[PDB]
């Protein structure tokens, strides 16, 4: 009983994330890129965060995304209580996925990370 939900603007070219084994971001005041299993989606500006590597049986359970035209900020927490972020700036509007199991992260990107389309189960 999966759902997909989009965050962010209408720009960029679509991508599918290659798995959810690791995540990093390149960020400044925007999310310049999300890095999924070492592959970036977005541009080259901003600073490279350390990589969050998921443990066995670990998945994103809560996520807060700030966005406007672009993804502005990402933070998440896993089912095991580990946290990533926040990374990015304070613009846009905040939306949260709570008590979920994220299965796949897709989106659209150009010079920035325009949008995310998150596939998840809802509890």
PDB file of N, CA, C and O in Angstrom, residues 60-96:
ATOM      1  N   UNK A  60      14.512   5.148   6.518  1.00  0.00           N
ATOM      2  CA  UNK A  60      13.983   6.430   6.954  1.00  0.00           C
ATOM      3  C   UNK A  60      12.565   6.283   7.428  1.00  0.00           C
ATOM      4  O   UNK A  60      11.714   5.780   6.709  1.00  0.00           O
ATOM      5  N   UNK A  61      12.323   6.749   8.654  1.00  0.00           N
ATOM      6  CA  UNK A  61      11.014   6.706   9.272  1.00  0.00           C
ATOM      7  C   UNK A  61      10.358   8.060   9.454  1.00  0.00           C
ATOM      8  O   UNK A  61       9.142   8.135   9.638  1.00  0.00           O
ATOM      9  N   UNK A  62      11.132   9.131   9.455  1.00  0.00           N
ATOM     10  CA  UNK A  62      10.614  10.478   9.583  1.00  0.00           C
ATOM     11  C   UNK A  62      11.532  11.389   8.754  1.00  0.00           C
ATOM     12  O   UNK A  62      12.739  11.232   8.767  1.00  0.00           O
ATOM     13  N   UNK A  63      10.935  12.334   8.037  1.00  0.00           N
ATOM     14  CA  UNK A  63      11.728  13.221   7.186  1.00  0.00           C
ATOM     15  C   UNK A  63      11.054  14.545   7.149  1.00  0.00           C
ATOM     16  O   UNK A  63       9.855  14.592   6.877  1.00  0.00           O
ATOM     17  N   UNK A  64      11.839  15.610   7.312  1.00  0.00           N
ATOM     18  CA  UNK A  64      11.349  16.969   7.138  1.00  0.00           C
ATOM     19  C   UNK A  64      12.099  17.614   5.973  1.00  0.00           C
ATOM     20  O   UNK A  64      13.323  17.640   5.918  1.00  0.00           O
ATOM     21  N   UNK A  65      11.304  18.103   5.026  1.00  0.00           N
ATOM     22  CA  UNK A  65      11.824  18.715   3.803  1.00  0.00           C
ATOM     23  C   UNK A  65      11.314  20.151   3.778  1.00  0.00           C
ATOM     24  O   UNK A  65      10.108  20.369   3.844  1.00  0.00           O
ATOM     25  N   UNK A  66      12.213  21.120   3.654  1.00  0.00           N
ATOM     26  CA  UNK A  66      11.809  22.506   3.335  1.00  0.00           C
ATOM     27  C   UNK A  66      11.997  22.700   1.841  1.00  0.00           C
ATOM     28  O   UNK A  66      13.025  22.269   1.299  1.00  0.00           O
ATOM     29  N   UNK A  67      11.027  23.294   1.177  1.00  0.00           N
ATOM     30  CA  UNK A  67      11.159  23.485  -0.271  1.00  0.00           C
ATOM     31  C   UNK A  67      10.334  24.651  -0.772  1.00  0.00           C
ATOM     32  O   UNK A  67       9.341  25.066  -0.146  1.00  0.00           O
ATOM     33  N   UNK A  68      10.785  25.157  -1.909  1.00  0.00           N
ATOM     34  CA  UNK A  68      10.038  26.112  -2.737  1.00  0.00           C
ATOM     35  C   UNK A  68      10.162  25.656  -4.170  1.00  0.00           C
ATOM     36  O   UNK A  68       9.756  24.542  -4.527  1.00  0.00           O
ATOM     37  N   UNK A  69      10.806  26.481  -4.994  1.00  0.00           N
ATOM     38  CA  UNK A  69      11.215  26.032  -6.321  1.00  0.00           C
ATOM     39  C   UNK A  69      12.144  24.838  -6.241  1.00  0.00           C
ATOM     40  O   UNK A  69      12.143  24.009  -7.134  1.00  0.00           O
ATOM     41  N   UNK A  70      12.993  24.862  -5.224  1.00  0.00           N
ATOM     42  CA  UNK A  70      14.015  23.822  -5.015  1.00  0.00           C
ATOM     43  C   UNK A  70      13.816  23.220  -3.656  1.00  0.00           C
ATOM     44  O   UNK A  70      13.120  23.739  -2.792  1.00  0.00           O
ATOM     45  N   UNK A  71      14.457  22.071  -3.434  1.00  0.00           N
ATOM     46  CA  UNK A  71      14.627  21.596  -2.090  1.00  0.00           C
ATOM     47  C   UNK A  71      15.606  22.516  -1.387  1.00  0.00           C
ATOM     48  O   UNK A  71      16.696  22.762  -1.869  1.00  0.00           O
ATOM     49  N   UNK A  72      15.170  23.058  -0.253  1.00  0.00           N
ATOM     50  CA  UNK A  72      15.951  23.980   0.564  1.00  0.00           C
ATOM     51  C   UNK A  72      16.687  23.319   1.725  1.00  0.00           C
ATOM     52  O   UNK A  72      17.753  23.747   2.094  1.00  0.00           O
ATOM     53  N   UNK A  73      16.091  22.262   2.304  1.00  0.00           N
ATOM     54  CA  UNK A  73      16.632  21.658   3.507  1.00  0.00           C
ATOM     55  C   UNK A  73      16.101  20.235   3.602  1.00  0.00           C
ATOM     56  O   UNK A  73      14.938  20.000   3.274  1.00  0.00           O
ATOM     57  N   UNK A  74      16.936  19.324   4.073  1.00  0.00           N
ATOM     58  CA  UNK A  74      16.510  17.974   4.390  1.00  0.00           C
ATOM     59  C   UNK A  74      17.026  17.590   5.764  1.00  0.00           C
ATOM     60  O   UNK A  74      18.173  17.830   6.110  1.00  0.00           O
ATOM     61  N   UNK A  75      16.171  16.890   6.496  1.00  0.00           N
ATOM     62  CA  UNK A  75      16.546  16.183   7.731  1.00  0.00           C
ATOM     63  C   UNK A  75      15.780  14.879   7.772  1.00  0.00           C
ATOM     64  O   UNK A  75      14.665  14.801   7.279  1.00  0.00           O
ATOM     65  N   UNK A  76      16.378  13.841   8.336  1.00  0.00           N
ATOM     66  CA  UNK A  76      15.638  12.616   8.516  1.00  0.00           C
ATOM     67  C   UNK A  76      16.070  11.877   9.755  1.00  0.00           C
ATOM     68  O   UNK A  76      17.127  12.122  10.311  1.00  0.00           O
ATOM     69  N   UNK A  77      15.210  10.961  10.175  1.00  0.00           N
ATOM     70  CA  UNK A  77      15.495  10.053  11.286  1.00  0.00           C
ATOM     71  C   UNK A  77      15.134   8.655  10.813  1.00  0.00           C
ATOM     72  O   UNK A  77      14.183   8.476  10.035  1.00  0.00           O
ATOM     73  N   UNK A  78      15.880   7.649  11.258  1.00  0.00           N
ATOM     74  CA  UNK A  78      15.619   6.294  10.865  1.00  0.00           C
ATOM     75  C   UNK A  78      14.806   5.550  11.924  1.00  0.00           C
ATOM     76  O   UNK A  78      14.592   6.014  13.059  1.00  0.00           O
ATOM     77  N   UNK A  79      14.348   4.369  11.540  1.00  0.00           N
ATOM     78  CA  UNK A  79      13.629   3.469  12.458  1.00  0.00           C
ATOM     79  C   UNK A  79      14.512   3.131  13.639  1.00  0.00           C
ATOM     80  O   UNK A  79      13.974   2.717  14.674  1.00  0.00           O
ATOM     81  N   UNK A  80      15.816   3.179  13.533  1.00  0.00           N
ATOM     82  CA  UNK A  80      16.746   2.906  14.631  1.00  0.00           C
ATOM     83  C   UNK A  80      17.136   4.161  15.438  1.00  0.00           C
ATOM     84  O   UNK A  80      17.953   4.086  16.348  1.00  0.00           O
ATOM     85  N   UNK A  81      16.521   5.313  15.105  1.00  0.00           N
ATOM     86  CA  UNK A  81      16.709   6.529  15.848  1.00  0.00           C
ATOM     87  C   UNK A  81      17.858   7.390  15.419  1.00  0.00           C
ATOM     88  O   UNK A  81      18.106   8.419  16.041  1.00  0.00           O
ATOM     89  N   UNK A  82      18.585   7.003  14.350  1.00  0.00           N
ATOM     90  CA  UNK A  82      19.692   7.780  13.884  1.00  0.00           C
ATOM     91  C   UNK A  82      19.189   8.957  13.040  1.00  0.00           C
ATOM     92  O   UNK A  82      18.179   8.861  12.380  1.00  0.00           O
ATOM     93  N   UNK A  83      19.951  10.042  13.048  1.00  0.00           N
ATOM     94  CA  UNK A  83      19.532  11.281  12.388  1.00  0.00           C
ATOM     95  C   UNK A  83      20.548  11.747  11.372  1.00  0.00           C
ATOM     96  O   UNK A  83      21.743  11.539  11.523  1.00  0.00           O
ATOM     97  N   UNK A  84      20.024  12.405  10.352  1.00  0.00           N
ATOM     98  CA  UNK A  84      20.827  13.060   9.320  1.00  0.00           C
ATOM     99  C   UNK A  84      20.306  14.471   9.168  1.00  0.00           C
ATOM    100  O   UNK A  84      19.111  14.666   9.001  1.00  0.00           O
ATOM    101  N   UNK A  85      21.189  15.467   9.162  1.00  0.00           N
ATOM    102  CA  UNK A  85      20.792  16.819   8.996  1.00  0.00           C
ATOM    103  C   UNK A  85      20.273  17.421  10.292  1.00  0.00           C
ATOM    104  O   UNK A  85      20.415  16.849  11.380  1.00  0.00           O
ATOM    105  N   UNK A  86      19.627  18.574  10.191  1.00  0.00           N
ATOM    106  CA  UNK A  86      19.303  19.280   8.942  1.00  0.00           C
ATOM    107  C   UNK A  86      20.459  19.781   8.126  1.00  0.00           C
ATOM    108  O   UNK A  86      21.463  20.212   8.723  1.00  0.00           O
ATOM    109  N   UNK A  87      20.357  19.796   6.844  1.00  0.00           N
ATOM    110  CA  UNK A  87      21.299  20.426   5.939  1.00  0.00           C
ATOM    111  C   UNK A  87      20.536  21.283   4.998  1.00  0.00           C
ATOM    112  O   UNK A  87      19.503  20.868   4.448  1.00  0.00           O
ATOM    113  N   UNK A  88      21.069  22.497   4.790  1.00  0.00           N
ATOM    114  CA  UNK A  88      20.472  23.454   3.831  1.00  0.00           C
ATOM    115  C   UNK A  88      20.120  24.750   4.571  1.00  0.00           C
ATOM    116  O   UNK A  88      20.649  25.078   5.645  1.00  0.00           O
ATOM    117  N   UNK A  89      19.191  25.463   3.970  1.00  0.00           N
ATOM    118  CA  UNK A  89      18.775  26.814   4.433  1.00  0.00           C
ATOM    119  C   UNK A  89      17.393  26.806   5.044  1.00  0.00           C
ATOM    120  O   UNK A  89      16.815  25.737   5.344  1.00  0.00           O
ATOM    121  N   UNK A  90      16.837  28.001   5.277  1.00  0.00           N
ATOM    122  CA  UNK A  90      15.574  28.217   6.012  1.00  0.00           C
ATOM    123  C   UNK A  90      14.389  28.713   5.164  1.00  0.00           C
ATOM    124  O   UNK A  90      13.331  29.061   5.714  1.00  0.00           O
ATOM    125  N   UNK A  91      14.527  28.782   3.847  1.00  0.00           N
ATOM    126  CA  UNK A  91      13.446  29.231   2.996  1.00  0.00           C
ATOM    127  C   UNK A  91      12.343  28.230   2.757  1.00  0.00           C
ATOM    128  O   UNK A  91      12.370  27.098   3.326  1.00  0.00           O
ATOM    129  N   UNK A  92      11.471  28.550   1.823  1.00  0.00           N
ATOM    130  CA  UNK A  92      10.443  27.646   1.386  1.00  0.00           C
ATOM    131  C   UNK A  92       9.436  27.391   2.494  1.00  0.00           C
ATOM    132  O   UNK A  92       9.161  28.267   3.318  1.00  0.00           O
ATOM    133  N   UNK A  93       8.819  26.246   2.457  1.00  0.00           N
ATOM    134  CA  UNK A  93       7.868  25.766   3.425  1.00  0.00           C
ATOM    135  C   UNK A  93       8.258  24.357   3.863  1.00  0.00           C
ATOM    136  O   UNK A  93       8.844  23.605   3.080  1.00  0.00           O
ATOM    137  N   UNK A  94       7.979  24.029   5.107  1.00  0.00           N
ATOM    138  CA  UNK A  94       8.307  22.731   5.671  1.00  0.00           C
ATOM    139  C   UNK A  94       7.165  21.743   5.483  1.00  0.00           C
ATOM    140  O   UNK A  94       5.967  22.065   5.705  1.00  0.00           O
ATOM    141  N   UNK A  95       7.512  20.508   5.106  1.00  0.00           N
ATOM    142  CA  UNK A  95       6.590  19.406   5.104  1.00  0.00           C
ATOM    143  C   UNK A  95       7.304  18.199   5.735  1.00  0.00           C
ATOM    144  O   UNK A  95       8.495  17.999   5.513  1.00  0.00           O
ATOM    145  N   UNK A  96       6.563  17.411   6.481  1.00  0.00           N
ATOM    146  CA  UNK A  96       7.126  16.243   7.145  1.00  0.00           C
ATOM    147  C   UNK A  96       6.400  14.977   6.782  1.00  0.00           C
ATOM    148  O   UNK A  96       5.165  14.934   6.866  1.00  0.00           O
TER     149      UNK A  96
END
